[PDB]
């Protein structure tokens, strides 16, 4: 009612939409850790940022896939 | 790479082992993200820190679902 504060480190969902493709950015901190994808010709699909910069993301649909760094904006 | 130089953010996983249980936490600026654990029992899946710091993770063994307390420390 008041008392809802936020404290360090506040994993809140950037949500966009692009076209017909609800981009949620999750960011705790200003860093995108994550991208919830909800297209609506592709489905809603988390998109988790693997560890490093390597530009490997993985799909909440299958994480026995390794998304490249091409296919990372298949969106 | 030979020499590094990461940006503000800077997501790196820490790999232990508490028990027969080997837990990665995908750590990236001070907040753990996601929890990839390997259980010896229970085989491994990734646990995602849903946005809100409330208390609640998805699992890539069903996004579907809604992850509560007494699960995400199901191990």
Tied chains: 1, 2.
Excluded: M
């Amino acid at each position: 009612g008041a008392d809802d504060d936020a404290p360090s480190g506040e994993p809140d969902v950037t949500i966009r939409q692009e076209g017909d493709k609800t981009i949620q950015e999750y960011r705790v901190n200003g860093f995108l850790y994550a991208i919830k994808v909800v297209p609506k010709h592709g489905k809603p699909y988390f998109l988790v940022r693997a560890d490093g910069s390597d530009g490997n993301f993985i799909r909440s649909d299958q994480p026995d896939k390794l998304i490249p760094q091409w296919e990372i904006f298949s969106w």
